Amino acid sequence: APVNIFKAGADEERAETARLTSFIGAIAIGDLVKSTLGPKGMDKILLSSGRDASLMVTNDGATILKNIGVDNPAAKVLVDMSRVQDDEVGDGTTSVTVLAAELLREAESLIAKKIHPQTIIAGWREATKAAREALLSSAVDHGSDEVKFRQDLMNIAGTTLSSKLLTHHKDHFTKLAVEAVLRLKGSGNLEAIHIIKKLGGSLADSYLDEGFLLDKKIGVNQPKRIENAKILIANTGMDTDKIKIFGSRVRVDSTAKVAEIEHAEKEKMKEKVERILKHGINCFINRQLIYNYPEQLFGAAGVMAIEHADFAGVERLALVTGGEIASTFDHPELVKLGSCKLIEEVMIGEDKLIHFSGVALGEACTIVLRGATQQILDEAERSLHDALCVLAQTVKDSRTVYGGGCSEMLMAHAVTQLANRTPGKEAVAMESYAKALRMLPTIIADNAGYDSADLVAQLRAAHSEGNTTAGLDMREGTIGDMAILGITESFQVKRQVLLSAAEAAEVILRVDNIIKAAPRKRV
Amino acid sequence: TLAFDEYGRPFLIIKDQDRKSRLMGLEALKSHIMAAKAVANTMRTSLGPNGLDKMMVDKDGDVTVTNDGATILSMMDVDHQIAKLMVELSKSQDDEIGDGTTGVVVLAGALLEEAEQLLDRGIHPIRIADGYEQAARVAIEHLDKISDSVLVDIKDTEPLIQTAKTTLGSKVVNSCHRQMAEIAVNAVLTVADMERRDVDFELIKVEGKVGGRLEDTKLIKGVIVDKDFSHPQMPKKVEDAKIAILTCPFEPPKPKTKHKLDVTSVEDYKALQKYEKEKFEEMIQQIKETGANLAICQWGFDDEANHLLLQNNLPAVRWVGGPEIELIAIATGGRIVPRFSELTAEKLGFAGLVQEISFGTTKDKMLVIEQCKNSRAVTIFIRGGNKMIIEEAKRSLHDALCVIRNLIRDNRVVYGGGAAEISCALAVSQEADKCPTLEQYAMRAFADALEVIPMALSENSGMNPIQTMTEVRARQVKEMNPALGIDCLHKGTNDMKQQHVIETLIGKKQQISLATQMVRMILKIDDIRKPGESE
Amino acid sequence: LVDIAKSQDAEVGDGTTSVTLLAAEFLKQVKPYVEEGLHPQIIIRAFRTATQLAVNKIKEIAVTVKKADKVEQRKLLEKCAMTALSSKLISQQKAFFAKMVVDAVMMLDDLLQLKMIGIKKVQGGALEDSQLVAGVAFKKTFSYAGFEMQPKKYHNPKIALLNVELELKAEKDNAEIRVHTVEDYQAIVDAEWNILYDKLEKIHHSGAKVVSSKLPIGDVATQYFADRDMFCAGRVPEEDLKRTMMACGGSIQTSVNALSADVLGRCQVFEETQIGGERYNFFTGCPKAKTCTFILRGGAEQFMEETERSLHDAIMIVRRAIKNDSVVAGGGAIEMELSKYLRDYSRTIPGKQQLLIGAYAKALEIIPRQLCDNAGFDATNILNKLRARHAQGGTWYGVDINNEDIADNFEAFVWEPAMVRINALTAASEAACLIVSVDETIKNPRST
Amino acid sequence: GPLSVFGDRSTGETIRSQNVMAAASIANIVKSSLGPVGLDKMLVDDIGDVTITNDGATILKLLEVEHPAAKVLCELADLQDKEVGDGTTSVVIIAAELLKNADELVKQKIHPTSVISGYRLACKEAVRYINENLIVNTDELGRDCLINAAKTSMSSKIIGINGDFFANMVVDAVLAIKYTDIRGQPRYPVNSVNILKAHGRSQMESMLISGYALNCVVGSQGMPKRIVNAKIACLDFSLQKTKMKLGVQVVITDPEKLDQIRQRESDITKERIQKILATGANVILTTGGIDDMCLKYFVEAGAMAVRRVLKRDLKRIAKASGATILSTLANLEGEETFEAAMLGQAEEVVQERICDDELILIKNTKARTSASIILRGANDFMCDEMERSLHDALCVVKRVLESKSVVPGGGAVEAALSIYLENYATSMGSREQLAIAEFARSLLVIPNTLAVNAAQDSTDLVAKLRAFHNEAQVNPERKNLKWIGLDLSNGKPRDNKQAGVFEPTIVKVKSLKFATEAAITILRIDDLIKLHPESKD
Numbered sequence A: 001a002p003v004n005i006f007k008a009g010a011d012e013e014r015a016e017t018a019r020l021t022s023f024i025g026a027i028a029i030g031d032l033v034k035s036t037l038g039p040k041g042m043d044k045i046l047l048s049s050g051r052d053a054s055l056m057v058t059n060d061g062a063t064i065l066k067n068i069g070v071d072n073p074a075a076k077v078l079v080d081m082s083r084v085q086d087d088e089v090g091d092g093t094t095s096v097t098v099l100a101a102e103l104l105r106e107a108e109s110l111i112a113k114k115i116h117p118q119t120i121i122a123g124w125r126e127a128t129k130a131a132r133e134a135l136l137s138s139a140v141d142h143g144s145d146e147v148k149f150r151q152d153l154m155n156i157a158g159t160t161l162s163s164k165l166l167t168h169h170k171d172h173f174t175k176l177a178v179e180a181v182l183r184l185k186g187s188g189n190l191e192a193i194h195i196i197k198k199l200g201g202s203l204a205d206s207y208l209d210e211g212f213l214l215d216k217k218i219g220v221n222q223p224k225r226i227e228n229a230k231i232l233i234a235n236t237g238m239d240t241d242k243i244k245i246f247g248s249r250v251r252v253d254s255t256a257k258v259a260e261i262e263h264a265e266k267e268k269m270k271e272k273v274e275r276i277l278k279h280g281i282n283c284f285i286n287r288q289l290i291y292n293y294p295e296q297l298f299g300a301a302g303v304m305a306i307e308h309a310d311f312a313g314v315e316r317l318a319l320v321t322g323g324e325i326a327s328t329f330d331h332p333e334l335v336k337l338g339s340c341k342l343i344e345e346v347m348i349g350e351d352k353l354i355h356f357s358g359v360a361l362g363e364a365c366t367i368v369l370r371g372a373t374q375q376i377l378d379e380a381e382r383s384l385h386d387a388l389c390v391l392a393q394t395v396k397d398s399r400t401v402y403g404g405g406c407s408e409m410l411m412a413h414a415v416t417q418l419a420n421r422t423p424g425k426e427a428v429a430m431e432s433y434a435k436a437l438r439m440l441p442t443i444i445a446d447n448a449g450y451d452s453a454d455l456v457a458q459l460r461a462a463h464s465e466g467n468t469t470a471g472l473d474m475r476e477g478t479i480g481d482m483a484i485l486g487i488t489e490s491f492q493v494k495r496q497v498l499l500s501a502a503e504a505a506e507v508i509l510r511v512d513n514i515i516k517a518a519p520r521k522r523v
Numbered sequence B: 001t002l003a004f005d006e007y008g009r010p011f012l013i014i015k016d017q018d019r020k021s022r023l024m025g026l027e028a029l030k031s032h033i034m035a036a037k038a039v040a041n042t043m044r045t046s047l048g049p050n051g052l053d054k055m056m057v058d059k060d061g062d063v064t065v066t067n068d069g070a071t072i073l074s075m076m077d078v079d080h081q082i083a084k085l086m087v088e089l090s091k092s093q094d095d096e097i098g099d100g101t102t103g104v105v106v107l108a109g110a111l112l113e114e115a116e117q118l119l120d121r122g123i124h125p126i127r128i129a130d131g132y133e134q135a136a137r138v139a140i141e142h143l144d145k146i147s148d149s150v151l152v153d154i155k156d157t158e159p160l161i162q163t164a165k166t167t168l169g170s171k172v173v174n175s176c177h178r179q180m181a182e183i184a185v186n187a188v189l190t191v192a193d194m195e196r197r198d199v200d201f202e203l204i205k206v207e208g209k210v211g212g213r214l215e216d217t218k219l220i221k222g223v224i225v226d227k228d229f230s231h232p233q234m235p236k237k238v239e240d241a242k243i244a245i246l247t248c249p250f251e252p253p254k255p256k257t258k259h260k261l262d263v264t265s266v267e268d269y270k271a272l273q274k275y276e277k278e279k280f281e282e283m284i285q286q287i288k289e290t291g292a293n294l295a296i297c298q299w300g301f302d303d304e305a306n307h308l309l310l311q312n313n314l315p316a317v318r319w320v321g322g323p324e325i326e327l328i329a330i331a332t333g334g335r336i337v338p339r340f341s342e343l344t345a346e347k348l349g350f351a352g353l354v355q356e357i358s359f360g361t362t363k364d365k366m367l368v369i370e371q372c373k374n375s376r377a378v379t380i381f382i383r384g385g386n387k388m389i390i391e392e393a394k395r396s397l398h399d400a401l402c403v404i405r406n407l408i409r410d411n412r413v414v415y416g417g418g419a420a421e422i423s424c425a426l427a428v429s430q431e432a433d434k435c436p437t438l439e440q441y442a443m444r445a446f447a448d449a450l451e452v453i454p455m456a457l458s459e460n461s462g463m464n465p466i467q468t469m470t471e472v473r474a475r476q477v478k479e480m481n482p483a484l485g486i487d488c489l490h491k492g493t494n495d496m497k498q499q500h501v502i503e504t505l506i507g508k509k510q511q512i513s514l515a516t517q518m519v520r521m522i523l524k525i526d527d528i529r530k531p532g533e534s535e
Numbered sequence C: 001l002v003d004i005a006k007s008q009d010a011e012v013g014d015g016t017t018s019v020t021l022l023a024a025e026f027l028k029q030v031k032p033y034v035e036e037g038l039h040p041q042i043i044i045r046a047f048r049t050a051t052q053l054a055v056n057k058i059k060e061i062a063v064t065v066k067k068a069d070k071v072e073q074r075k076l077l078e079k080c081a082m083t084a085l086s087s088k089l090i091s092q093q094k095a096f097f098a099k100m101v102v103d104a105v106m107m108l109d110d111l112l113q114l115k116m117i118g119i120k121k122v123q124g125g126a127l128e129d130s131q132l133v134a135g136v137a138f139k140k141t142f143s144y145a146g147f148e149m150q151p152k153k154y155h156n157p158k159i160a161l162l163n164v165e166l167e168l169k170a171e172k173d174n175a176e177i178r179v180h181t182v183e184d185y186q187a188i189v190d191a192e193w194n195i196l197y198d199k200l201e202k203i204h205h206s207g208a209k210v211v212s213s214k215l216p217i218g219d220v221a222t223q224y225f226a227d228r229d230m231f232c233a234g235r236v237p238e239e240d241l242k243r244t245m246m247a248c249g250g251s252i253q254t255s256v257n258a259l260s261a262d263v264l265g266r267c268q269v270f271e272e273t274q275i276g277g278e279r280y281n282f283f284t285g286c287p288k289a290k291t292c293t294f295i296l297r298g299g300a301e302q303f304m305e306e307t308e309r310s311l312h313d314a315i316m317i318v319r320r321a322i323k324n325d326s327v328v329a330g331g332g333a334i335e336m337e338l339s340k341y342l343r344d345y346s347r348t349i350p351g352k353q354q355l356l357i358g359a360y361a362k363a364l365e366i367i368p369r370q371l372c373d374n375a376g377f378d379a380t381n382i383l384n385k386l387r388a389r390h391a392q393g394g395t396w397y398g399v400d401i402n403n404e405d406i407a408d409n410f411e412a413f414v415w416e417p418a419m420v421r422i423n424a425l426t427a428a429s430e431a432a433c434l435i436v437s438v439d440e441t442i443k444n445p446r447s448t
Numbered sequence D: 001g002p003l004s005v006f007g008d009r010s011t012g013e014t015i016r017s018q019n020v021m022a023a024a025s026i027a028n029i030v031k032s033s034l035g036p037v038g039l040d041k042m043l044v045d046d047i048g049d050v051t052i053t054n055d056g057a058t059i060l061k062l063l064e065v066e067h068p069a070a071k072v073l074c075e076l077a078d079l080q081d082k083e084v085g086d087g088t089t090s091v092v093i094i095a096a097e098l099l100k101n102a103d104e105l106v107k108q109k110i111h112p113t114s115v116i117s118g119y120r121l122a123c124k125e126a127v128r129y130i131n132e133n134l135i136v137n138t139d140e141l142g143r144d145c146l147i148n149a150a151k152t153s154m155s156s157k158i159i160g161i162n163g164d165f166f167a168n169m170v171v172d173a174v175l176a177i178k179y180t181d182i183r184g185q186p187r188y189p190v191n192s193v194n195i196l197k198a199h200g201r202s203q204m205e206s207m208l209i210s211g212y213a214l215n216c217v218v219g220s221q222g223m224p225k226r227i228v229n230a231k232i233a234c235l236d237f238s239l240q241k242t243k244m245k246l247g248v249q250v251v252i253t254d255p256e257k258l259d260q261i262r263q264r265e266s267d268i269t270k271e272r273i274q275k276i277l278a279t280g281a282n283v284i285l286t287t288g289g290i291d292d293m294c295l296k297y298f299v300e301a302g303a304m305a306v307r308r309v310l311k312r313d314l315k316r317i318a319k320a321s322g323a324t325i326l327s328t329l330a331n332l333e334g335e336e337t338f339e340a341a342m343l344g345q346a347e348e349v350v351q352e353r354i355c356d357d358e359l360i361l362i363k364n365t366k367a368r369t370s371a372s373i374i375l376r377g378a379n380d381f382m383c384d385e386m387e388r389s390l391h392d393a394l395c396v397v398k399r400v401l402e403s404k405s406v407v408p409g410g411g412a413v414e415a416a417l418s419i420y421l422e423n424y425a426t427s428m429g430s431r432e433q434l435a436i437a438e439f440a441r442s443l444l445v446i447p448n449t450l451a452v453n454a455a456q457d458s459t460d461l462v463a464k465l466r467a468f469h470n471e472a473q474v475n476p477e478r479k480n481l482k483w484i485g486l487d488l489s490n491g492k493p494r495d496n497k498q499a500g501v502f503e504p505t506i507v508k509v510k511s512l513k514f515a516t517e518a519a520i521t522i523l524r525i526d527d528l529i530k531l532h533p534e535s536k537d
Helices: A018-034 A061-065 A076-088 A093-112 A117-137 A146-161 A170-182 A255-277 A292-300 A313-321 A374-394 A406-419 A424-448 A452-464 A491-509 B027-046 B069-074 B081-096 B103-120 B125-143 B158-168 B179-189 B266-288 B303-311 B322-332 B387-409 B419-432 B440-450 B452-460 B465-478 B505-523 C003-011 C017-034 C040-061 C071-084 C094-106 C182-203 C219-227 C238-248 C301-323 C333-346 C357-363 C366-373 C379-389 C419-435 D013-033 D056-062 D068-083 D090-106 D112-132 D143-154 D165-175 D255-275 D292-301 D311-321 D380-402 D412-424 D433-442 D445-453 D459-474 D506-522
Strands: A011-014 A044-046 A056-058 A193-199 A207-209 A212-214 A230-234 A248-250 A283-286 A304-307 A345-347 A352-356 A365-371 A400-402 A470-473 A478-481 A488-490 A511-516 B053-057 B063-066 B204-210 B218-220 B223-225 B241-246 B261-263 B294-297 B349-351 B354-357 B366-369 B378-384 B413-415 B502-504 C117-123 C131-133 C158-162 C210-213 C231-233 C269-273 C280-284 C292-298 C327-329 C397-399 C406-408 C415-417 D008-010 D041-044 D050-053 D194-199 D207-214 D226-235 D283-286 D304-306 D344-353 D358-363 D371-377 D406-408 D484-487 D492-495 D502-504 D528-530
Touching: A011 A018, A018 A061, A018 A076, A018 A093, A018 A491, A018 A511, A056 A061, A056 A374, A061 A076, A061 A093, A076 A093, A076 A491, A076 B387, A093 A117, A093 A424, A093 A491, A117 A406, A117 A424, A117 A491, A146 A170, A146 A374, A146 A400, A146 A488, A170 A207, A170 A365, A170 A374, A193 A374, A212 A313, A212 A365, A230 A313, A248 A255, A255 A292, A255 B266, A283 A313, A292 A304, A365 A374, A374 A488, A400 A406, A400 A491, A406 A424, A406 A452, A406 A470, A424 A452, A424 A470, A452 A470, A452 A478, A488 A491, A491 A511, A491 B387, A511 B027, B027 B069, B027 B081, B027 B103, B027 B452, B027 B505, B053 B069, B063 B069, B063 B387, B069 B081, B081 B103, B081 B505, B103 B125, B103 B440, B103 B452, B103 B505, B125 B419, B125 B440, B125 B505, B158 B179, B158 B387, B158 B502, B179 B218, B179 B378, B179 B387, B204 B223, B204 B387, B223 B322, B223 B378, B241 B322, B261 B266, B266 B303, B266 C182, B322 B349, B322 B366, B378 B387, B387 B502, B387 B505, B413 B419, B413 B505, B419 B440, B419 B452, B419 B465, B440 B452, B452 B465, B502 B505, B505 C301, C003 C017, C003 C419, C017 C040, C017 C357, C017 C366, C017 C419, C040 C333, C040 C357, C040 C419, C071 C094, C071 C301, C071 C415, C094 C131, C094 C292, C094 C301, C117 C301, C131 C280, C158 C238, C182 C219, C219 C231, C238 C280, C292 C301, C301 C415, C327 C333, C333 C357, C333 C366, C333 C397, C366 C379, C366 C397, C379 C397, C379 C406, C415 C419, D013 D056, D013 D068, D013 D090, D013 D445, D041 D056, D050 D056, D050 D380, D056 D068, D068 D090, D068 D506, D090 D112, D090 D433, D090 D445, D090 D506, D112 D412, D112 D433, D112 D506, D143 D165, D143 D380, D143 D502, D165 D207, D165 D371, D165 D380, D194 D207, D194 D380, D207 D311, D226 D311, D255 D292, D283 D311, D292 D304, D311 D344, D311 D358, D371 D380, D380 D502, D406 D412, D412 D433, D412 D445, D412 D459, D412 D484, D445 D459, D445 D484, D459 D484, D459 D492, D502 D506
Parallel strands: A193 A365, A230 A283, A248 B261, A283 A304, A511 B053, B204 B378, B241 B294, C117 C292, C158 C210, C210 C231, D194 D371, D226 D283, D283 D304
Antiparallel strands: A011 A511, A044 A056, A207 A365, A212 A352, A345 A352, A400 A488, A470 A478, B053 B063, B218 B378, B223 B366, B241 B349, B354 B366, B413 B502, C131 C292, C269 C280, C327 C415, C397 C406, D008 D528, D041 D050, D207 D358, D207 D371, D226 D344, D344 D358, D406 D502, D484 D492
């Protein structure tokens, strides 16, 4: 390759530095986020080069990696993996990142033993299948007996949150996550639970709004508070309707006709509002802006009107008020209205918001998030998003596994017991798969500062002789029973960590040659 | 000399002659051979199921790990006039057959490498090229002696699935060795025109979405399109679809020419506003009169239409793309109606279950028509744990579709694993000495070049080439030449019939023919006229 | 020495490389004499004298046939093709292309116009996979919505070649439609749709199962035609429509107001195949096709490009051979004999001409010399034998290609039209007379 | 991949073609100065010195060349100066043409060693032909061969007069310096003839001096400037105050001795200068110097004393006047001797004026009667060329006297070969007949170039010459047409024996041998490698 080069401005690496630099660049990703694994990890601050640097403090590996700007063509492979984990389940993004890195570290050591890269891949495929069975046979189901099901949701919410900023506020934010999802009783849209961020007060001062909050305060000449209001939402035009004729002009002999037409213009706007008001409404929300003329007509009628609460605000209101978009009003008897108790405005963080309280069929909620600083608000918001994403799926697939390293040791056990039944050419590779699986409880203990030399030996010794629920007790620094402590993880989150790390890791092992095209726009 | 004549004056023949580069001699031939060795060695490590893949980094930073030769070479910044032709060779093989994207490069390389010592012996460059053609016919005529299949393209698809396994066995999706082989068989056999033996790949759509794993790859007897329901409260399920397909926008008719409507009186102002409000009723009721319960629209909707769709319980999608609305019409058997007033029940499409598929936490909620009647179009949905495996899987499945089409056009097959190449090499050697008139050296060189494939396969499999070929070739002359090949794990015996290593006859026939012509047109050159500086 | 090749390309068609080399040799042979006096006037006189003698002798030795309108004349054209396709990137396909070239030209009318034979390159396949099409074909230009319908199986279609637009937007770029009422608003909208449909119905009811236009055919027309069991393809270039008219035996109509069965073409097969991977639309089956199309297949663009050129050469050579059957032996055979006549001439004249006419004759050896030096063949001893054989026996002795020896090119049927050498001699000598007549050169310093 | 040498590699036709052009580039210069009809060249150096000459060797040595194949032709001319003495133009012309015609052969796939072999065979045969077709020795022509040879050479130079003014000075100066030796060696050391320049009178007032012209002056304006019947004292030690040697010190402890020891430094000197005059010496010649103290004694004695002359000049004076060179004191443990009997003689020693300069003449010398020639030109430009032209003429006559054989000029010898060698090619013509024929054809460049430079007919004038030389060989009637050449002043053939156009046999026998071998060497330079220069280390 370096001798007799026939390339224009490109280069290539073969069999010498191609794999060396690929393993170094990719494995480094794991060490970056390694410190974020477990309940005692430290958080990162990510900084930009300038031009409104927009400082970000975060813990989650996905938010860290997606803002680094990795240039190495091989390291990018694991970055995309962590993106997929975030999009699918929204948790475990650190665990899958560091697991893939540890698998790749072992592969480099296996190449040093002169093991063919296809033998290493073949061994990992067999080890992966062994690990998949360990998860299938150890899953815990939850069906009926709702007093036990709700407890499972509290355990899943607590586990996810324990790894984020919301550490010693678990007694407030655990309920905000579990109950907000249970109140939806429907599709996991993950937009029906809105978060409003305000400065002032502590994290413990956050609360759940039983109703629905709107922006865009109640008009100019309109009632501020109506009891037992009927709610109508709309997606129609208030003014400049320009009814559907393109290229039409008013061409008259004198300005007298223009004035007469101007009156007709307003008469039709008056009729339009009357057609809406015949519905018998107290509150009107329209996506499109409200102009001076209909504002007076709605005020004179004693009916409030909200303009452009949001683009999707009307759709969200439809779900929490029990109505319909109603972009056209020509059959009032076919239009369903909503109902609430109060439409009064409330003061939250020195900002007046419109509070729809006591709303019937209210399949939505809002969480009011309070904090001292903007960095606290942004990380606390993300913590709520992560927990709600997992819970919205747990209520659909109730299978869970035991956490605290329990599942990882069970997977490593199955791989080890079967690897010892295979010939050495491949067993050396299957054993390396199990060794990577055991690195996860090692990293967790190491981040906390526990003597991992004893926790790993004790946990493996426990699982060697039954004790299929044994795991790490991160409070005392010992080995405990995960079922009694209540440390569980979603089955789907754990399945994807196993499968994604194995599938992504193969991508690096298969490559012996990197060909780099000539760069553009670099002078 | 240049820039100096016998009388001291400058000597100028061609523009910028002092900044040109010219080489003829015998070194132009050596330079062509040197460049060919670089190309052949580049892909040598990606031949066979035990080969390794390459990582290609594009000029914009995108990274793809590739198995197919067409992509590997197309992404290289090659600055040599003959090396580019070797890239074009791989492209032609990809366009004609779709299999030997590496084989034609390795084979062509060996023929050019053998030319090196043939030239050193003093053999005229043309004689070398002519000898290759004379021996190439012998390999081709022998190749066609051994072939048989019983594929009927009805139900006995076992040897067809086996062919797809051979094609996919070298790809990055071996975790679906069986699953994807069967998808490819069903995808082609359900759209091919068996009466004319015409396969139209436009009827097989390749789609995918990041997420899931390779085991989730499915064949959909229908279409997958981007969802965009006109009204947010439309039902998520249609039990029995009667589909009206229009390309007319849901707005009052506008003329295509300059219009400029004159409004004078208040009676004209109010009347025109009234008339327009009545037109939205017609474009909707004219759909209901046909019994339709799902509208497909290439254009968008006006706001007034969106509410009327709710009132009449008429779900609809908006802004359906060009190939999407054409594909729905084909899959559902309907027709596109230019206007609303031309709507009739006879032009409606017929389909069953229509529903959305949700993916993780995303907001895509793609719309799929799953049930159909006698559709001639299918969709293949590729999933995977990352972008890298998915994009390569799309190309891997393309190869599986091509080899099935190749058997449909010509159902003659050969044995792979190097068996066909070794057998041809032996045949040429047997005739090379019957009779060594002038070209004995070239006929033997061709036969040796044919073996570059099982030898490179042996190297990539970890075996000693010359030791492996000695044992394999000896067994094929001691007995009536059986189809013996090589492998890494040996799989017991090396009988390609028992390992089910099946390749297409017309594939290898074209690999020999295209390589033979490409070698000739790059040996029969004695002048390289590459320019110098760009300015 | 380049411009003379441009002229030979027009007058001969393949007299290219030979005229540049001969002209250069004419100057080399006199180079040692022009440096020592030798007034340019006598150089021109000698060049003209030898030139006129050489071209006169060719006419006296060229051979013709008396077997016109017989298989013997077709075989004569094939013999000419063998030498026309020589020195090309063709090894064993000489008889494959030659048979198609000879017949492709003989099937033309008594103009033998070269515009009636089209050649198109399609990537993929070997030289022997090319095909000669009785009619025409095009590459399936830009398609519209619905072109996945309209089946491509026809056994007796009629062809409408139109220059009509079939889009809805029938606007003249100068129309302003002033409307005062809603009843008239809709009437104008309906009129625009009626104009499009009126044209479409006039195209239909004609039997024109296949309609082609150089102008756009819109989505509405595609769907209308599909439901009415008609095939359309628009945006077809005029070059192919002109050939299509001559191939299908019809006419091209601009207005749809005067369509009938009397302007349509006819063929037997109308299909779109997958040669080379891309779709290609073929016509064939017209017995009154005045043209033909040759589709080339090959493994590279450059591979096919050189092939296309070899087809243009062969077509031009056999075209002229049909009209002028006077041929001479190829190789260097005629050049050795012409030098014999000139040497006998020059050795009978006293004075300075002995150094000039003889020099012209000596230049004629460059052809048999280069035909040997480029592949060995011991050029010195081959010339020694040729000069001895031509003095005793026949006049067509040249150099063999298989054996390194002399062979009679006439018995080997290595023939080329006599005009190849007559024109080459004229241009090569004409250039020599222009070059030696210059005494001064002036170069303006301005370059902008 | 390629050769890993940091220079450039050029092989095959690239260097083979360049070798011929480099040779032609040099030949294109000298071809314009061939024959009596050639014209002079002007060479100007970087600093402004202007040189005018028609000597081929001077021109080529002054012109800078780069290509090593051009340096060979420059050396070829130098060989003619050493071996021949007047052949410095045609030797390059012949050699370059052998290279040009040889190139035409090897480009036809004729192995270079086939051409080289033919060239060596034909060259040896050409010499054999010349030695069988000679005209006459120098015994029947007597003086005529010496005046004719002198005028034939000078016809190409600025002193190419029609008269015998210069020719008589050339021949007589050579004949006057005849020295015998053992084994029949009648030496003519023309290098002993002292040639002087002066920008003064016209060319026709040149002096022929019987004796030796000494390029020095008497100096102190109190010595006699004319002495008749002089005794000449030729010595080589200085006449100055005597210095002490570096290894000897004068350390004095008695101040009374300061005057005697100091005075001795001048007394020991004057004792010697009196004794070189006590022998009767009249002209004292020293290559060292005479200080102001010693000059007094020659003035008072009425003697001439000439100081700071060249050692090569005094040795020539002593040999011509019969003196012995004495450098020290000797004669059988004698303190002061000065070899009184070893003085030379001259009839007259006089200092004359030679156009605002001074020159000492020692006339007739009475032992060997040596010669000097004083040339006169209008300016320095003519004087420099006249000196070179006289030297050439003196050398040509020397060659005639040593090698008693002449050949015809005017291209006659080359014309005779252009016929004989063509017939020779038909006797041994198996494979080398192309090289033999081209060797012979190369010879015609001489009568061809001569016709061009004279502005005469070319292809007809030379062709007619060859017809005469053909008949002499194909019609053996003793027609004696072998001595016919070209008359460049009339455009007609002439009999060179009756016209008196003679050249020494060796001028052509040697030129053919050296020109052939030089070309053969250049014809074996097919490969050339050039390394990057080392300038800054």
